Amino acid sequence: QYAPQTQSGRTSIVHLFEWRWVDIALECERYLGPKGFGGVQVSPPNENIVVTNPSRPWWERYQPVSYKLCTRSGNENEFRDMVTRCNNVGVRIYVDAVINHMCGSGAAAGTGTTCGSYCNPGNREFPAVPYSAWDFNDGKCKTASGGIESYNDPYQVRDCQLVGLLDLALEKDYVRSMIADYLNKLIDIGVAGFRIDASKHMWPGDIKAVLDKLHNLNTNWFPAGSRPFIFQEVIDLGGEAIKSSEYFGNGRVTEFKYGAKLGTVVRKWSGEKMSYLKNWGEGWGFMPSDRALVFVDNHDNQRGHGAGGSSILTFWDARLYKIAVGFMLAHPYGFTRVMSSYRWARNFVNGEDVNDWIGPPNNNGVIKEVTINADTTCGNDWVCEHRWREIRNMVWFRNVVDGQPFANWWDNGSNQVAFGRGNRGFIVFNNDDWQLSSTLQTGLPGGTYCDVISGDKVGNSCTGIKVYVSSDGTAQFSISNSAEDPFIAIHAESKL
Ligand SMILES: OC[C@H]1O[C@H](O[C@H]2[C@H](O)[C@@H](O)[C@@H](O[C@H]3[C@H](O)[C@@H](O)[C@H](O)O[C@@H]3CO)O[C@@H]2CO)[C@H](O)[C@@H](O)[C@@H]1O
Ligand SMILES: OC[C@H]1O[C@H](O[C@H]2[C@H](O)[C@@H](O)[C@@H](O[C@H]3[C@H](O)[C@@H](O)[C@H](O)O[C@@H]3CO)O[C@@H]2CO)[C@H](O)[C@@H](O)[C@@H]1O
Ligand SMILES: OC[C@H]1O[C@H](O[C@H]2[C@H](O)[C@@H](O)[C@H](O)O[C@@H]2CO)[C@H](O)[C@@H](O)[C@@H]1O
Ligand SMILES: [Ca+2]
Ligand SMILES: [Cl-]
């Protein structure tokens, strides 16, 4: 469940948060395929409850009412069309599987749902599944409120309601099977794997029971005997009762310590310095690389009060964000997931964004299409970080150096560091408040390389900075602390 199942050589996936199926299909063909992206994590494709207060927040999609592929992103025909078109150009689709719960227990009964299905939350009725009161954890939960009151008790975290959400009785074969049927339909359609939502709130064994029922991947695009890629979303920053390691037997796990620690370091908070990143990975107390799904930020924490809090770097802090994303994409640790967001009107009161609920760009509830501008950026307030040259080229960098070991590390004892990947790539960073001017061993063959951060290799020339590597592998890197992008990256395919 550990292999990403991306086409050979493609090493990253991108979270196209709240994007509609038709836009993702076009994106695979016009961009993701040609640019070497391994796949796309899509928002929950199953029907959810409509939330009118606030008006259509992004989080209403985490309140399932059925397993019908009918959402604001599109219907079943559009979903299938997207999976087919993306797979046909070598770009995989990974589904955000919301299976720990249904909608809020306080929600009203009716057909105010994304596909018009009926549900009565108060009586635990979800006829479109179908689920009834017998399929929920109400009696199993031992807290007086019926909700999670203490994370120090693994039992209530798994058996009680997460923020009032109706907790599914995952111990039951009926429920496990109902979930497996939904997931298997997705697999047969062409999906390569799943992001298991709120995994921390389910027992590792229950998840395993669901996973054991899954089909092998569709042979139209994958080799026979291929198991779906599984990455479980478990928020574990350490120092708590539930550990990410409890889920290693099911597949990969999201390493939230990654972005929290990296953001703190790049921001230079708590006395942290980039030079400390020499032993990045397990050296920093992280899970094994082969069990990790890493990222700088995700849809939750980019809003400021998730795992990592204010230390999390996002598109709002563009310069430092590109540095953090670049370091991640160059470092061999874990399987990388790049974030792709939309802008919203932030309003911090007492250190917290009260507008963090704002849903995707829309016209009266209808999600806007993703328009592409001549300069390759996006319109309609879709940030499209995955299209920024500095990120796009680092995604390619990761593909180029795939399999090469961490090597030639260098640091100035403060915030200037550098390292390579075997003899195929090298990256240099200056995060200090002064000039970087050093001749370093790159581990690369002599020649002239185009810096893929400031530009690209076009024909027999570079559009940006050029790096002349000596016969002995050394090269001078001069980066001012006032540079827009204080880092340089070169690889085998950027060589003239
Ligand atoms: O009515 C039930 C509750 O609904 C709302 O909770 C939101 C959260 O505020 C929001 O962060 C989001 O949480 C999910 C998160 O995005 C995902 O990464 C994690 O793995 O699982 C979470 C649940 O699936 O969605 C929930 C559900 O809508 C509302 O904020 C709360 O007050 C209500 O009690
Ligand atoms: O190894 C498990 C721990 O790994 C991580 O610790 C980081 C520190 O956060 C970071 O400050 C740094 O520690 C240096 C320390 O600040 C300095 O006084 C000393 O002289 O050198 C230390 C080594 O560079 O590096 C370590 C990792 O090596 C992680 O943050 C922590 O939670 C884990 O327990
Ligand atoms: O590849 C398209 C353009 O991407 C970059 O521009 C980014 C910029 O780096 C980032 O700080 C900002 O937040 O977003 C813009 C794009 O919206 C490159 O710098 C440009 O040269 C590219 O044209
Ligand atoms: Ca649960
Ligand atoms: Cl996540």
Contacts of 496 (CB under 8 A, 6+ apart): 447, 448, 449, 450, 457, 460, 461, 462, 466
Closest CA to 427 of 280, 236, 237: 280
Q: What is the resolution of this structure in A?
A: 2.0
Q: Which atom of ligand 1 is the closest one to the Cα of 163?
A: 34
CA distance 35 to 410: 30
CA distances from 293 to 39, 393, 402, 495 (A): 13, 20, 16, 30
Quick one: three-class SS letters along the chain? CCCCCCCCCCCEEEEECCCCHHHHHHHHHHHHCCCCCCEEEECCCCCEECCCCCCCCHHHHHCECCCCCCECCECHHHHHHHHHHHHHCCCEEEEEECCCEEEECCCCCECCECCCCCEEHHHCEECCCCECHHHECCCCCCCCCCECCCCCCHHHHHHCECCCEEEECCCCHHHHHHHHHHHHHHHHHCCCEEEECCHHHCCHHHHHHHHCCCCCCCCCCCCCCCCCEEEECCCCCCCCCCCHHHHCCCCEEECHHHHHHHHHHHCCCCCCCHHHHHHCCHHHCCCCHHHEEECCCCCCHHHCCCCCHHHCCCHHHHHHHHHHHHHHHHCCCCEEEEEECECCCCCEECCEECCCCCCCCEECCEECCCCECCCCCECCCECCHHHCHHHHHHHHHHHHCCCCCEEEEEECCCCEEEEEECCCEEEEEECCCCCEEEEEECCCCCEEEECCCCCCEECCEECCCEEEECCCCEEEEEECCCCCCCEEEEEHHHEC
Angle of the 318-330 helix axis to the 389-400 helix axis, nearest 10: 10
Burial 124-147 (b: 16+ CB within 10 A, else e): bbbebbebeeebbbbeebeeeebb
Backbone angles phi, psi at 312, to 5 degrees: -60, 125
- For strands 252-254 and 229-232, give the pairing: parallel
Q: How far is the CA of 64 from the centre of ligand 4 (A)?
A: 14
Half-sphere exposure of 451 (CA within 13 A, CB side): 21
Beta bridge partners of 16: 340
CA distances from 361 to 8, 378, 386 (A): 34, 12, 18
CA distance 196 to 447: 45
Backbone angles phi, psi at 69, to 5 degrees: -80, 80
> What is the chain's Cα-based Rg?
23
114: which 2 tokens?
């994304």
Report the residue among 276, 277, 409 best suited for mutation to probe ligand 2: largest number of ligand atoms under 8 A from its CB.
Answer: 276
Contacts of 107 (CB under 8 A, 6+ apart): 49, 63, 119, 121, 122
Q: How far is the CA of 100 from the centre of ligand 4 (A)?
A: 5
374 lines ligand 3 (CB under 6 A): no
CA distances from 40 to 192, 203, 255, 296, 441 (A): 10, 27, 18, 16, 36
- Binding residues for chloride, by number, are 195, 298, 337
Q: Which residues are catalytic?
A: 197, 233
10: which 2 tokens?
């493609």
278 lines ligand 2 (CB under 6 A): no
Contact 400, 491 (CB under 8 A): yes
Q: Which atom of ligand 2 is the closest one to the Cα of 270?
A: 11
Q: Which atom of ligand 1 is the closest one to the Cα of 98?
A: 24
Burial 52-84 (b: 16+ CB within 10 A, else e): eeeebbbbbbbbbbbbbbbbbbbbeebbebbbb
Q: How many CB atoms lie within 10 A of CB 459?
A: 6
- Region label for 56, one of left (φ > 0), alpha (ψ between -120 and 50) or beta (otherwise): left
390 lines ligand 3 (CB under 6 A): yes
- Domains along the chain with CATH numbers: 2-403 (3.20.20.80), 404-496 (2.60.40.1180)
Q: How far is the CA of 168 from the centre of ligand 4 (A)?
A: 6
- For strands 229-232 and 193-196, give the pairing: parallel
Any idea which ligand is nearest the CA of 237? 2
Any idea which ligand is nearest the CA of 252? 5
Experimental technique used to determine this entry: X-ray
Closest CA to 426 of 483, 385, 476, 462: 476
- Binding residues for Ca(2+), by number, are 100, 158, 167, 201
Q: How far is the CA of 163 from the centre of ligand 1 (A)?
A: 7
Q: Which atom of ligand 3 is the closest one to the Cα of 318?
A: 11
CA distance 115 to 68: 8
